[PDB]
Amino acid sequence: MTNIRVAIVGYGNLGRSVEKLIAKQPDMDLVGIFSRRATLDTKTPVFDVADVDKHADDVDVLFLCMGSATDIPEQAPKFAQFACTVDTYDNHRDIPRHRQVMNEAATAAGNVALVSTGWDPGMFSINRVYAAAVLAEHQQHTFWGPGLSQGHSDALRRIPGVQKAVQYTLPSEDALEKARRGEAGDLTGKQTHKRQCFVVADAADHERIENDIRTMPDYFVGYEVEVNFIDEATFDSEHTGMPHGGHVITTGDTGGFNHTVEYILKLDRNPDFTASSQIAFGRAAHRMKQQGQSGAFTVLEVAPYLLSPENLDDLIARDV
Amino acid sequence: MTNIRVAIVGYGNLGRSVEKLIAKQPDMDLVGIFSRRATLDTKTPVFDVADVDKHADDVDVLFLCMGSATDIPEQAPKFAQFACTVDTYDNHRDIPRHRQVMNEAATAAGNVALVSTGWDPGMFSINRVYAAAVLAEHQQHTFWGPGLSQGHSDALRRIPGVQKAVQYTLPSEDALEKARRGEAGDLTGKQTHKRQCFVVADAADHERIENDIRTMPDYFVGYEVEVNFIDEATFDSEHTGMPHGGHVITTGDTGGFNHTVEYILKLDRNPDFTASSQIAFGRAAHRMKQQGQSGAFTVLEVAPYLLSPENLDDLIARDV
Ligand SMILES: NC(=O)C1=CN([C@@H]2O[C@H](COP(=O)(O)OP(=O)(O)OC[C@H]3O[C@@H](n4cnc5c(N)ncnc54)[C@H](OP(=O)(O)O)[C@@H]3O)[C@@H](O)[C@H]2O)C=CC1
Ligand SMILES: NC(=O)C1=CN([C@@H]2O[C@H](COP(=O)(O)OP(=O)(O)OC[C@H]3O[C@@H](n4cnc5c(N)ncnc54)[C@H](OP(=O)(O)O)[C@@H]3O)[C@@H](O)[C@H]2O)C=CC1
Ligand SMILES: N[C@@H](C[C@H]1CC(C(=O)O)=NO1)C(=O)O
Incomplete structure (x- = not known):
């Protein structure tokens, strides 16, 4: 019933921060890391980015952590076909196009793709x-x-x-x-x-x-x-x-x-905060799919409560 | 285009603030003020609060601006049967109760009630x-x-x-x-x-x-x-x-x-900023009703874009 099966794609600074931070989540299980490289410095299982299709059924949401400047445009749409996705794409003038191509792929697969999350785009945008x-x-x-x-x-x-x-x-x-x-x-x-x-x-x-x-x-x-x-x-x-x-x-x-x-925002480590933001929207992405939604959405399109690990009633009775 | 028809119930500081601010909205027409007092210092039409049912068809959303102390808890639910409502109710310990009761009235009437908007109960909550x-x-x-x-x-x-x-x-x-x-x-x-x-x-x-x-x-x-x-x-x-x-x-x-x-938040005039928030959410309540939803919702359950007078597309291309 509970627990979102998660996986990271791209083991750079951001990739390492989300691996570290998934441990602080009460509702997520890291299944593995999809990388272009064979030898990574981690106890987490590593898979080939090419074998993603083979893990389609054991992963609920893929955290895209590859480079924005060159990797995201070409690779991102490919992954939306296998599971829900969350990226931190930051080329602002390219966001409408990215949202469109990701929407096509996600809608066709019945998945939810949360695009351009993080702090900018992301929290600052909101x-x-x-x-x-x-x-x-x-x-x-x-x-x-x-x-x-x-x-x-x-x-x-x-x-x-x-x-x-x-x-x-x-x-x-x-x-x-x-x-x-x-x-x-x-x-x-x-x-x-x-x-x-x-x-x-x-x-x-x-x-x-x-x-x-x-x-x-x-x-x-x-x-x-x-x-x-x-x-x-x-x-x-x-x-x-x-x-x-x-x-x-x-x-x-x-x-x-x-x-x-x-x-x-005063961040000691950019990768860590960005990763925290990405994880939260990863939770929302999954919840939105459970409710019958599909396609690509920006941060402006998800109700705030979806990001929290606590149920709505607790938030209404304590934070409003 | 269409243009949201709004009315203000209660004419205190808050009511006065929402009145002058509607003039600044590109998509709102002020139909009148529903007051318990007959003669107000205003050019806008004044109507007896008991005659709200007589205007139920001329109004899209009612801005509730009476006192939180005793007025909101007893009167608010009654208004939710005539049109969409937006209140800035600040009794934190009573919010879950006020929401449940408003949700009963709103759902029955097929309307959208946005409760507890403003800055603390409101922006700070978000x-x-x-x-x-x-x-x-x-x-x-x-x-x-x-x-x-x-x-x-x-x-x-x-x-x-x-x-x-x-x-x-x-x-x-x-x-x-x-x-x-x-x-x-x-x-x-x-x-x-x-x-x-x-x-x-x-x-x-x-x-x-x-x-x-x-x-x-x-x-x-x-x-x-x-x-x-x-x-x-x-x-x-x-x-x-x-x-x-x-x-x-x-x-x-x-x-x-x-x-x-x-x-x-640095506010020169409290009721003015409270009104601005209440108004933005009034736009959101109206859009949510057009999309088939009903019942009562807190500021935590509405997507950010829904408050803006711009198109979602213009928002995505410019502010994300
Ligand atoms: N929206 C926002 O507010 C924010 C967005 N970002 C975005 O985050 C993205 C990631 O930055 P960051 O993670 O620091 O970048 P890195 O360069 O550290 O990671 C990028 C990619 O390079 C690869 N790779 C990593 N290390 C090596 C290596 N040593 N040798 C060869 N290839 C390697 C990885 O793929 P693989 O493991 O498969 O080889 C990894 O996915 C940026 O593109 C940026 O746009 C970041 C902060 C905020
Ligand atoms: N959530 C938030 O961040 C914020 C919330 N608030 C809430 O909003 C409310 C603000 O009301 P506010 O306008 O400041 O209070 P007022 O006391 O000025 O207005 C309250 C009600 O009293 C009436 N009335 C007003 N003026 C007179 C008068 N001169 N003589 C007799 N009766 C009068 C009105 O009804 P009628 O016209 O029918 O007589 C009005 O609806 C508060 O109750 C508070 O809970 C306010 C700021 C922020
Ligand atoms: N997109 C940035 C996040 C913030 C920081 C930034 C900049 O310094 O220009 N723009 O946005 C990142 O990848 O770190």
């Missing part, structure tokens, strides 16, 4: 919509960092020549304070964030790599970008942590009265 | 359940203010000699900082908030009044209190407003990694 809906007349801005962005970091490593790479998003603190006072209108995220890259690569490949970085669509174009090529020794010791966070600020006026809505 | 869901093991606290506490203000006003008074509940800056780092597990309610009083009275009574305040049990004893005796002119110009707000702070450890989720 907040943007709530604050904007409530405050008719409003101004809204999202700030990231300072911290390590997993999507931009992975995008850098797919560039040939890049041995090791990491990217930090640096927000304009000046603009963040202006937002709080409702005086940052017309200012965009591309204008309030700097992107600094720390890359380890052969000197000969520098020019090319730098070109591919500054011209990469969505992740980098239109942003101020600093590229640093550093010694591998310095990399392995200075760039090991994965902190991050952000602020979604919304101000509104009701006729001579201002209101400020602020959602803040 | 956030509590969200952050608690995501962060498996966690600590959670909610702080109110700075804001005018009617309960404590009234305690101040019944002191002999007090001409005018008001009390502001402020969050302890020390306590907020501790909750942010997950160190507030041992803090008591008398340690999480400070109390600031503004009393107008003859100087001859200042010493006795200050003592009456500082020793008043259940309201100020054990708390850190601040008393200020101001001029009546300073009172009328600076303490007639209705500010409020609060902080919802949640933390969680993921294996030596801490995460902080903080939701902040």
Whole structure:
């Protein structure tokens, strides 16, 4: 009767965080990890991503943890055919297309696919919509960092020549304070964030790599970008942590009265929080299937209570 | 296009706030105000609350704005038989009961009743359940203010000699900082908030009044209190407003990694923001009725997109 049979697809940072965190769940059993690699450092059973079809009946929801920049678009739709799915796809300009192709696959299989979960997209997306809906007349801005962005970091490593790479998003603190006072209108995220890259690569490949970085669509174009090529020794010791966070600020006026809505996240480890978010929506995905639903849904489409491990009545009697 | 026809029951501060705000809604038409009083200071049509049945067909959703104390529990169910209803009922300990009773009336009439909307019962409820869901093991606290506490203000006003008074509940800056780092597990309610009083009275009574305040049990004893005796002119110009707000702070450890989720609300006028929320949910109740649902629902059971005046598609392409 109880217990969601879960499985991870892609054993990177995010993949390792969801494996770790499934242990804190009272209703989930990790059945295994589907990977492109043969030897993983874990006691959890490893399967070939190609043998997913063979495990279709013993898995309720697959947690997609492959790279957004190149893996998700091509691979994601494939898995929706075998079980419910949850991803953290973050290329915003590509979300409507992704939602459509995942809906096709999920609807045909009778499954539920929760797309673009996490904190951004994910929690920040939900907040943007709530604050904007409530405050008719409003101004809204999202700030990231300072911290390590997993999507931009992975995008850098797919560039040939890049041995090791990491990217930090640096927000304009000046603009963040202006937002709080409702005086940052017309200012965009591309204008309030700097992107600094720390890359380890052969000197000969520098020019090319730098070109591919500054011209990469969505992740980098239109942003101020600093590229640093550093010694591998310095990399392995200075760039090991994965902190991050952000602020979604919304101000509104009701006729001579201002209101400020602020959602803040201070994450010690980006992979871990993202993984916690993904797991919660994994629970909702499954519950939605149990109730007769199918297709791809964004975070804006699931009622909040579906994420909780506790039943509705307990939440209504304690948290409302 | 179609345009949702709305009516306001009860014309207090909340009712006044929803009235002026509907003018800002792109899809709502105000049909009238159902009041117990015949002559209101407004251009909008006023109708006897006993004649709601006579207008049952001219209205889509009724914004219930009477007092929570006694009005909502006895009157609210009766209105649910005429149209969709939205209330901001804040008696936390009575919510499960109010929901069950409203669900009986709403289901019978085939309507949708959205109960307990607003900011604490409302936005804060949504956030509590969200952050608690995501962060498996966690600590959670909610702080109110700075804001005018009617309960404590009234305690101040019944002191002999007090001409005018008001009390502001402020969050302890020390306590907020501790909750942010997950160190507030041992803090008591008398340690999480400070109390600031503004009393107008003859100087001859200042010493006795200050003592009456500082020793008043259940309201100020054990708390850190601040008393200020101001001029009546300073009172009328600076303490007639209705500010409020609060902080919802949640933390969680993921294996030596801490995460902080903080939701902040700074409101210049309490009833104005409450009205904004109540209105957004009125749109949601109407859309839910169009989709074939009925019965009563809390803010935890409605999907975020349902509150927005935009198309789901525009939302997905722009805010996710
Ligand atoms: N929406 C949101 O708020 C958030 C989204 N994200 C997203 O998370 C995604 C994942 O980032 P992250 O997990 O840190 O990236 P990693 O590069 O660490 O993991 C990516 C993929 O690379 C593979 N791989 C991993 N290690 C190696 C290795 N050592 N040698 C060769 N191949 C390897 C994996 O597949 P395999 O094991 O099969 O080989 C893994 O699935 C990003 O694309 C980003 O978009 C992250 C945070 C938040
Ligand atoms: N959930 C949340 O976050 C929040 C909830 N609340 C809730 O909303 C409610 C707000 O009501 P609010 O408008 O502040 O209170 P009021 O006392 O101003 O209004 C209450 C009722 O009294 C009546 N009445 C109003 N003015 C007068 C008058 N001058 N003379 C005599 N009768 C009058 C009205 O009915 P009629 O017109 O029929 O006479 C009105 O419906 C509260 O009860 C509270 O529970 C408020 C803020 C936030
Ligand atoms: N998508 C991000 C999560 C947040 C952080 C971010 C950025 O720094 O630009 N954008 O969104 C990630 O993969 O880590």
